[PDB]
């Protein structure tokens, strides 16, 4: 079973140049992300090698989804887990304005506009986590089943909490392609920061950028 109450509990449980600040926040939040994933029903039951594959595959989308939702009441900016706000003007002035504006326009504003709630965010994150397309999984079917149980629970929760909005479920799922795209661009930036040595990159974030 995949009860939304436990997925919400996982969310609640875990609550200077801007690129440096964002990378320092990412490294901090990777530690938190492991503690979050352990609280998602059935995750800790997967083979250790599969838990590693899923977190290596998902971390960037999972962190972006988190800081995006955290930022819904910020004007044209994001709230990092460190408590530092970053405004789009600062992002632009650091050379990362384009990807910053995609986060604001495709994620933060769309989460704000539909008032995405923490159960919904939790369920979208659990869908991301249970990615049956992650390469090298010992048993992709097992992850496919867990993803299906999450989106079944989410749709039930949407139909029960927001029964005035027939399309809310579809609307939630249709942020995932934007998140995928934004995650890939953010990862491209991080690899470049690491190549050029323009930014301190702490140990856990560096490990996530290691080859498999």
């Amino acid at each position: 079973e995949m009860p939304v109450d436990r997925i919400l509990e996982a969310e609640l449980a875990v609550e200077n140049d801007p690129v440096t600040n964002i990378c320092q926040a990412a490294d901090k939040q990777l530690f938190t992300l492991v503690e979050w994933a352990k609280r998602i029903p059935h995750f800790s039951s997967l083979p250790l090698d599969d838990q590693v594959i899923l977190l290596r595959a998902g971390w960037n989308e999972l962190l972006i989804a988190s800081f995006s939702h955290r930022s819904i009441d910020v004007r044209d900016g994001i709230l990092l887990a460190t408590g530092l706000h970053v405004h789009r003007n600062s992002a632009h002035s650091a050379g990362v304005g384009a990807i910053f504006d995609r986060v604001l326009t495709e994620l933060v504003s769309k989460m704000r506009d539909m008032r995405m709630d923490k159960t919904e965010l939790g369920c979208l994150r659990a869908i991301i986590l249970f990615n049956p397309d992650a390469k090298g999984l010992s048993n992709p079917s097992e992850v496919e089943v867990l993803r299906e149980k999450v989106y079944a629970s989410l749709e039930t929760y949407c139909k029960q909490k927001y029964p005035e909005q027939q399309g809310r479920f579809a609307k939630l799922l249709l942020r995932l392609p934007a998140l995928r795209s934004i995650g890939l661009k953010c990862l491209e930036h991080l690899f470049f920061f690491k190549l050029i040595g323009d930014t301190p990159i702490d140990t856990f974030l560096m490990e996530m950028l290691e080859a498999p």
């Binding site: 352990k38 838990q51 590693v52 977190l55």
Partner: peptide, 13 residues
């Protein structure tokens, strides 16, 4: 080797 990630996932603390 993904040292940190393995360590954090294994640990029951």
């Amino acid at each position: 080797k993904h040292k940190i990630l393995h360590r954090l996932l294994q640990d029951s603390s």
